[PDB]
């Protein structure tokens, strides 16, 4: 009956290799420069630049060869190497695949396989029929080897010939033309530049000669290189430091030139084709074009994130391609590819995948390097310790929630992600983002935080929900005070009511309540009201103190107001509260700590059994149908008939869910259809011979009262969230940012010739 299938996309792919800098971006612009090819973790998207839409999509799942192969793409080359819309994809392992865009994907592409002996392919490139490849072989520093690639027609094979070798490569970069390679090695350190197709350029010099003496006096940040760029001619080499100082070195005589604007570490450096301009970017969220003739600079500020990579992409520098990071989300690295028009510095094409915020960091994600160690960044020293600590936490520790809140708009079916201080509206049918809106005050895009400013925490959008009608949006926010003050511990809880007409795309804030429920008391739960009561224009908010507040929209006031309250000043605290409302609206089921209460809505007090005790704390209360109520506790789940007040089924959850999730996240793991039945989702770590990073999730469809299992499905990755679309199908979000769904003649010759001409 039911079936599982992936629907939407995932994160854009990057060359996630530590040493290579300035070559992180793999997307390419066609020779006609009419469309941009971007590889994703699960597909390849071809976007038309002129119209800013995804003209074509090549999904790995659809093609058998790509499905078996997909390992990550290390490069894309326009045309076919062996031989007008062909592309050659080189993966890290060595699979060379010739695909076609602008057409229908062929089920038998020209698959090949380069022969590498314990080598990981890192980069490939060409100038005119001559091809070289760079490969990685193994002090925590990887060494590199340079081969020459040629295709022999007779054997139809790729032959590799040794050309060069370098050891202990710390940092690397390739010129814009793709014919020079600059690299820093520990043979403290030395920089060497080599011509790649020729022997014309071959130079090396210690970094000590470049470094200023004052740097030798100062801390290590001054002597730490974070970025490196090499000019096409090889006459200039720009070195960027963690201090934020750029030094252009003239290779002929090693003369230095200091350019100092970046207050924090510079992350991206790139030369123009003629070499007269220098793109720089870093934590400032501002892209600076240094005019080297007069040392001037032009700025493009208030970008969406910190700039990881900069490039001038065109025969005449028509476009600038940037990679943005959005360091607010510590759980995941949120990359965004931005193609700007050089003429007027307007976004010609902005591309990014879904941006969920998980509870904790996942897999091997490491924050970018900064001048100082902060919550959003790592210092130079903190990197290795943080990596080791992350791996040890993922292995040894038992708290492995990685659960994210997501909402679905009933009217539009758009998918709302509560990013930190902002909401991302993402359309999973088209697999494109539709909006990004700031829903809080704070330092969000006023300026780029640097150094100690980076320790500030913007307001966090904790809960985001829609009414049944779908015309109102309720948002709950927590504002964190700055540190080192008397009022550095008094968090401010805010509730906001937003409204929006269907035609427009921007929500307009209508009411704002500061410190609802009192001062420093969280709104642990929110439940929009059913259609019966006030035509779905009311909501309930519940605390960790057992207090309940019912707000509704009054036409006379024209704004929301607190219609009802029950503020029992319980003396104990617990974040394990869940809340359900009957479809008719007569009764409200409030589960606090271990006890469930049935409150009559009219008097907003207990009915006149109302009290039901559970073995452990309640995580979720839901009523699949008016008759039956499913109650989940930390040790089990139970189905109760409200009519009989008796338990029908009880399923033990302790073996799988003991302390893996914090209280309240089982709510976002469990969802229920209003017609057919509910759905339970259980993730298990996979280990063979100590726990391993990889995870496996199981989804189980349950009928009302949980008598039978309609379906049992398994997915091969940790599923962060699962909810019920307003159609019969369920949508689940996976930590790979993947949204899957579980659901049920002479004239003819002359015409051809004229078309050719």
């Amino acid at each position: 009956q039911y079936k599982l299938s992936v629907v939407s996309g995932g994160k854009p792919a990057l060359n996630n290799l530590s040493s290579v800098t300035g070559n992180k971006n793999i997307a390419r612009l066609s020779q006609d420069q009419r469309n941009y090819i971007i590889p994703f973790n699960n597909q390849i998207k071809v976007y038309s630049v002129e119209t800013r839409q995804c003209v074509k999509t090549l999904k790995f799942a659809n093609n058998s060869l790509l499905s078996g192969i997909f390992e990550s793409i290390v490069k894309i080359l326009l045309g076919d190497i062996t031989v007008a819309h062909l592309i050659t994809v080189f993966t890290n392992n060595g699979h060379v695949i010739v695909l076609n865009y602008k057409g229908k994907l062929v089920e038998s592409p020209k698959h090949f396989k380069i022969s590498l002996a314990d080598e990981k392919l890192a980069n490939v490139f060409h100038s005119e029929g001559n091809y070289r490849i760079l490969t990685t072989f193994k002090n925590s520093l990887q060494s590199y080897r340079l081969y020459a690639l040629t295709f022999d027609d007779a054997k139809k094979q790729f032959e590799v010939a040794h050309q060069a070798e370098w050891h202990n490569v710390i940092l690397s970069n390739i010129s814009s033309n793709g014919k020079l390679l600059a690299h820093m090695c520990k043979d403290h350190k030395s920089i060497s530049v080599v011509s790649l197709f020729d022997d014309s350029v071959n130079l090396s010099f210690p970094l000590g000669s470049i470094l200023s003496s004052q740097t030798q006096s100062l801390s290590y940040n001054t002597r730490y290189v974070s970025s490196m760029a090499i000019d096409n001619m090889g006459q200039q080499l720009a070195v960027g430091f963690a201090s934020g100082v750029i030094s252009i070195v003239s290779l002929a005589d090693l003369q230095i030139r200091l350019l100092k604007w970046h207050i924090d570490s510079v992350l991206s450096l790139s030369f123009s084709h003629d070499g007269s301009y220098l793109l720089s970017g870093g934590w400032e969220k501002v892209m600076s074009l240094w005019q080297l003739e007069t040392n001037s600079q032009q700025f493009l500020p208030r970008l969406n994130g910190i700039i990881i990579d900069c490039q001038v992409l065109g025969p005449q520098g028509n476009y600038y391609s940037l990679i943005l990071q959005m360091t607010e989300n510590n759980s995941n690295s949120d990359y965004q590819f931005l193609l700007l028009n050089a003429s007027d510095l307007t976004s010609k094409l902005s591309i990014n995948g879904p941006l969920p915020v998980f509870n904790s960091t996942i897999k091997h994600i490491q924050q970018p390097i900064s001048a100082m160690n902060t919550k959003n960044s790592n210092s130079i020293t903190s990197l290795n310790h943080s990596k080791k600590k992350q791996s040890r936490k993922l292995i040894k520790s038992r708290r492995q929630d990685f659960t994210t809140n997501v909402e679905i708009n009933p009217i539009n079916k758009n998918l709302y992600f509560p990013h930190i201080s902002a909401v991302q509206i993402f359309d999973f049918y088209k697999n494109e983002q539709v909006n990004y809106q700031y829903l809080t005050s704070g330092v969000n895009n006023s300026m780029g935080k640097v150094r100690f400013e980076l320790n500030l925490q913007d307001p966090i959008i904790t809960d985001l929900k829609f009414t049944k009608d779908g015309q109102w949006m309720i948002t709950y926010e927590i504002e964190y005070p700055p540190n080192d003050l008397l009022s550095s511990k008094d968090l401010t809880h805010i509730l906001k009511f937003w409204t929006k007409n269907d035609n427009e795309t921007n929500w307009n804030l209508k009411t704002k309540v500061i410190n609802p429920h009192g001062i420093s008391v969280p709104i642990t739960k929110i439940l929009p009201s059913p259609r019966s009561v006030n035509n779905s224009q009311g909501c309930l908010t519940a605390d960790n103190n057992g207090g309940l507040k019912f707000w509704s929209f009054d036409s006379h006031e024209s704004n929301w107001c607190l219609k009802k309250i029950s503020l029992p000043n319980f003396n104990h605290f617990s974040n394990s509260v869940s809340l359900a409302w009957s479809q008719d609206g007569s009764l409200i089921f409030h589960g606090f700590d271990d006890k469930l209460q049935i409150l009559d809505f009219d008097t907003f007090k207990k009915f006149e059994v109302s009290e039901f005790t559970l073995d452990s704390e309640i995580q979720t209360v839901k009523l699949i149908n008016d008759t039956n109520l499913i109650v989940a506790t930390r040790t089990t789940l139970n189905a109760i008939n409200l009519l009989r007040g008796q338990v029908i089924n009880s399923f033990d959850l302790y073996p799988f869910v003991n302390g893996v999730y914090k209280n309240g996240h089982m709510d976002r793991l469990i969802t229920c259809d209003e017609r057919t039945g509910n759905i339970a989702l259980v993730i298990n770590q996979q280990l063979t011979d100590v726990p391993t990073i990889n995870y496996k999730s199981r989804i189980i469809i349950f009928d009302s009262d949980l008598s039978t299992k309609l379906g049992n499905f398994t997915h091969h990755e940790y599923i962060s969230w699962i909810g019920w679309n307003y159609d019969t199908d369920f949508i689940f979000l996976d930590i790979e940012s993947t949204l899957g769904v579980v659901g049920t003649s002479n004239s003819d010759i002359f015409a051809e010739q004229l078309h050719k001409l």
Partner: protein, 600 residues
């Protein structure tokens, strides 16, 4: 929802046809027009006696009576008020059958007799509808003929449904148009269902269907709001118009125990998805959507009660939840007397709130999965424990902990399996019977920490364990759902300082300020004064409790002499509390000429 006590309308005559109680409801007809939510009048045709109109309120009274010969059987009756050619009039239409030889259709007009008319009907008259707007009388006959007449009984139109031996015909209005559906038995338990619309022909056939497996002989039928309900062998079959398709079958176990032949069953609707069911002298108000028994009432002073008609509430549009139902009641005794009675019925709000915990339908932990991943017999135990000799603590604890593999004397999350309430209750009963006095087993201490301690045993619990301090202390800290009444009584009765603070902490944690405050008023003035004297002799959970006392006691009840001592105490604490707050915050917190000595 509730059922009122029946009140007497009239006593039925002692006629032979009415002597057969089981068929008596068939001999009494209730007019549809006069019996509704807003009408205070009931027109009733008692076969062989008369057609009589009664007023219900303020007192039952006979307002009109039309006599009928004793040998005539009333087969159909209806009465409606309207304007006729214009004077306000009440048109009465009734059909009588005398020995099956002749069938009489009669129309009477009364000024609010203006005229009386009588014709011979071809067959038995079952349903009569009066259209005062068009001045028409419509009759349905047993030969399948639907005849339309004026108030002068002049035949204007006749429609043949092509089927004879009709058994059920009911009128209803939808969106302002008058509709009627008929059920005609066929052979082999097959029944023809037809739906007709009233507008060359004023009668239009909309649907005609044959339904299989539909028996009449033991089936009670009623219709309400596009749904036809059939009660048969304890199962209520719900059919939905216009196609009369079976939607739901609801089993009614309380009827399944009825021997076939002795129990008298009547079945009528009262509201949306709600009906009245009577079994002999017991009247049930049932909600069919939720399958719950909203209300039940037994009439001990009558042998049987049969529903005749009920004023049905359209609860979705009507804010009124009170209606009436009329039935025939039969007294116990050698000379039973059958009488007409009316019952006031409160249907309710039609919400799931009403049906909570009232179903008329009468566990073990199961693995989540039937079958390389990181991991994070109750009766036998009862029998073994019960077999023990009196006051044998060591054996009792050994069996309980060993058999259940319980490792700690207090409940832990690893003991989720024991959480079946039935086993815990029996062990608790065993512990009390097995042990009395001053020595209880350690199993009791484990149960006190169990989250699912039965509520039935919470009462008087603190008293039993008063003798042993540790066991009393355990009950305060961990025992669930302890009554507040006992906790407050023990609060003011215990002189132990430690227990008072724990009792203070427990009361606040589990109970609201409002809930606690009301009980505190009930406590004697002397006890609260004694508690106050104790204070004058974590502390906030005692003081905040005291602040509740000062609110409960009230302004008048407080006495000046003791109040001064309390004032001196509180002012003492405020000075100290301010002092400590200051300490806490503190913990959180060149010359032109200078003479110096040189070291050389």
């Amino acid at each position: 929802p509730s059922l009122s006590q029946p009140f007497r309308l009239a006593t039925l005559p002692k006629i032979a046809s009415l002597s057969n109680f089981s068929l008596q409801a068939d001999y009494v007809q209730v007019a549809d027009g006069t019996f509704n939510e807003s009408t205070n009048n009931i027109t009733l045709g008692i076969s062989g006696s008369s057609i009589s109109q009664y007023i219900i309120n303020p007192t039952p009274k006979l307002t009109f009576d039309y006599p009928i010969p004793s040998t005539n059987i009333i087969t159909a009756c209806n009465a409606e008020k309207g304007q006729a050619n214009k004077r306000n009039v009440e048109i009465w239409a009734f059909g009588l059958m005398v020995n099956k030889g002749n069938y009489t259709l009669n129309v009477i007009t009364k000024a609010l007799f203006l005229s009386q008319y009588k014709i011979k009907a071809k067959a038995k008259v079952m349903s009569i509808k009066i259209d005062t707007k068009n001045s028409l009388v419509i009759a349905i006959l047993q030969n399948g003929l639907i005849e339309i007449f004026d108030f002068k009984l002049t035949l204007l139109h006749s429609f043949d449904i092509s089927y004879d031996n009709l058994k059920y015909a009911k009128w209803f209005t939808e969106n302002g148009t008058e509709y009627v559906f008929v059920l005609c038995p066929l052979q082999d338990d097959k029944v023809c269902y037809k739906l007709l619309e009233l507008t060359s022909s004023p009668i239009k056939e909309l649907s005609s269907t044959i339904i299989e497996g539909f028996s009449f002989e033991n089936s009670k039928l009623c219709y309400q709001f596009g749904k036809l309900y059939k009660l048969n062998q304890g199962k209520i079959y719900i059919y939905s118009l216009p196609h009369c398709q079976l939607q739901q079958v609801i089993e009614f176990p309380m009827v399944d125990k009825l021997s076939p032949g002795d129990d008298l069953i009547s079945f009528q609707p009262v509201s949306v998805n709600r009906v009245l069911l009577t079994v002999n002298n017991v009247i049930y108000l049932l909600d069919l959507l939720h399958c719950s028994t909203l209300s039940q009432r037994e009439l001990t002073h009558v042998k049987t009660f049969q529903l005749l008609k009920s004023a049905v509430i359209n609860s979705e549009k009507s804010h009124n939840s009170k209606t009436i139902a009329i039935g025939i009641s039969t007294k116990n005794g050698p000379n039973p007397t059958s009488s007409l009675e009316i019952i006031n019925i409160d249907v309710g709000t039609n919400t799931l709130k009403d049906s909570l915990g009232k179903s008329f339908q009468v566990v073990i932990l199961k693995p989540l999965f039937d079958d390389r991943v990181k991991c994070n017999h109750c009766n036998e135990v009862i029998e073994k424990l019960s077999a023990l000799q009196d006051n044998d603590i060591t054996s009792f604890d050994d069996i309980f902990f060993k058999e259940l593999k319980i490792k700690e004397e207090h409940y832990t999350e690893k003991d989720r399996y024991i959480s079946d309430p039935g086993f815990l209750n029996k062990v608790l009963d065993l512990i009390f019977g097995k042990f009395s006095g001053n020595d209880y087993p350690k199993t009791l201490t484990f149960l006190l920490t169990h989250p699912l301690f039965p509520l039935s045993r919470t009462r008087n619990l603190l008293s039993l364990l008063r003798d042993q301090p540790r066991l009393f202390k355990q009950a305060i800290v961990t025992c669930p759902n302890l009554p507040l009444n006992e906790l407050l009584e023990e609060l003011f009765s215990i002189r132990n300082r430690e227990l008072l603070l724990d009792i203070s902490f427990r009361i606040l944690q589990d109970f609201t300020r409002d809930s606690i405050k009301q009980e505190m008023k009930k406590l004697s003035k002397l006890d609260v004064q004694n508690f106050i004297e104790f204070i004058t002799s974590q502390s906030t959970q005692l003081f905040q409790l005291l602040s509740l006392v000062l609110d409960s006691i009230g302004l008048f009840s407080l006495e000046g002499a003791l109040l001064e001592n309390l004032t001196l105490y509180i002012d003492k604490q405020v000075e100290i509390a301010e002092r400590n707050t200051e300490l806490w915050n503190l913990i959180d917190t060149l010359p032109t000429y200078t003479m110096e000595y040189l070291d050389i």
